[PDB]
Amino acid sequence: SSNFNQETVTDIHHWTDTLFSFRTTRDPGFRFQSGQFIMMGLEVNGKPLTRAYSIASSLYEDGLEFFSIKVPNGPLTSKLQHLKKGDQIIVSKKPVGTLLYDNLKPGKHLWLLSTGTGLAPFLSIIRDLEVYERFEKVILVHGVRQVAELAYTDFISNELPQDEFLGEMVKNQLIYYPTVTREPYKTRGRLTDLIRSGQLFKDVGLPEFNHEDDRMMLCGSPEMLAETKQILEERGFTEGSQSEPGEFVIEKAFVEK
Numbered sequence: 696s697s698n699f700n701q702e703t704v705t706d707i708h709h710w711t712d713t714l715f716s717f718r719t720t721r722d723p724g725f726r727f728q729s730g731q732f733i734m735m736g737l738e739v740n741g742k743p744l745t746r747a748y749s750i751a752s753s754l755y756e757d758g759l760e761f762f763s764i765k766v767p768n769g770p771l772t773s774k775l776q777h778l779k780k781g782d783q784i785i786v787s788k789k790p791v792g793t794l795l796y797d798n799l800k801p802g803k804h805l806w807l808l809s810t811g812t813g814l815a816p817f818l819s820i821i822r823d824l825e826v827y828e829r830f831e832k833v834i835l836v837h838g839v840r841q842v843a844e845l846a847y848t849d850f851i852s853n854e855l856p857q858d859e860f861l862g863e864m865v866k867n868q869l870i871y872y873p874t875v876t877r878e879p880y881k882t883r884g885r886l887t888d889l890i891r892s893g894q895l896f897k898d899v900g901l902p903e904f905n906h907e908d909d910r911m912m913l914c915g916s917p918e919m920l921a922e923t924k925q926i927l928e929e930r931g932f933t934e935g936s937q938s939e940p941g942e943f944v945i946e947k948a949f950v951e952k
């Protein structure tokens with residue numbers, strides 16, 4: 696240890712039996728950009744047990760936040776799911792990630808396409824003032840299997856527009872598009888299937904993807920990433936990086952182990 700920050704959990708909210716979010720303290724020296732992740736975990740037998748976790752809290756927040764999965768036989772989240780208020784967690788002090796604005800070229804629209812816990816890094820981005828200065832429209836797409844998996848759906852819809860600080864920009868510039876596959880919901884199907892049929896653009900009121908206006912940030916399941924990456928690359932969109940800005944950047948919400 697000592698390469699980590701000791702933070703204290705301040706709030707825990709369990710969305711389902713597999714999804715829960717918890718907030719912690721934020722070290723005064725901990726600094727990050729919206730869309731980055733860190734090594735988050737526990738101190739086990741004097742050794743760090745950490746996994747990659749996107750920072751779901753705003754960089755303006757005096758605190759951290761993590762949108763976490765709950766795996767029964769998972770080394771970290773089986774102990775991490777039983778977190779309580781006041782418990783100690785360790786966060787690495789070196790953020791890293793590809794979900795940065797500077798990895799994208801200046802555009803008119805930012806399409807945040809996410810599934811499951813891939814909403815975590817975009818909860819920080821939509822709660823960043825800079826994304827609304829750089830992009831006229833921020834489209835936050837969240838794909839889940841059940842309605843109960845739509846975490847933060849009342850916060851983004853009802854409480855984020857009332858933010859004393861980002862409210863008028865979230866009201867004007869943020870578009871929130873949740874979709875559910877396996878339960879009756881007002882939006883059905885995979886987010887890829889909504890791109891092929893064009894229902895995504897009919898619902899959000901924006902034209903189809905073009906190389907001049909639309910930038911994308913992808914953070915979801917490997918099967919959504921590989922399917923949306925083929926969709927984006929075959930229309931001409933290129934992947935951006937630190938050395939070469941592009942139209943879309945991609946981060947894994949998890950890996951299949």
Ligand SMILES: Cc1cc2nc3c(=O)[nH]c(=O)nc-3n(C[C@H](O)[C@H](O)[C@H](O)COP(=O)(O)OP(=O)(O)OC[C@H]3O[C@@H](n4cnc5c(N)ncnc54)[C@H](O)[C@@H]3O)c2cc1C
Nearest residue numbers: 747748749763764769770771772812815948949950951952
């Ligand atoms: C860049 C990056 C960012 C990440 N951001 C997040 C984040 O914001 N929130 C988060 O919960 N995880 C995130 N992860 C995944 C992270 O590794 C998980 O915390 C971890 O895999 C699960 O903890 P574990 O050790 O108990 O389970 P593991 O032993 O690591 O894996 C348990 C099983 O569940 C699967 N799994 C792991 N994470 C998820 C997930 N989020 N959703 C669905 N299935 C999953 C794995 O593929 C595996 O089969 C991220 C991973 C990367 C690489």
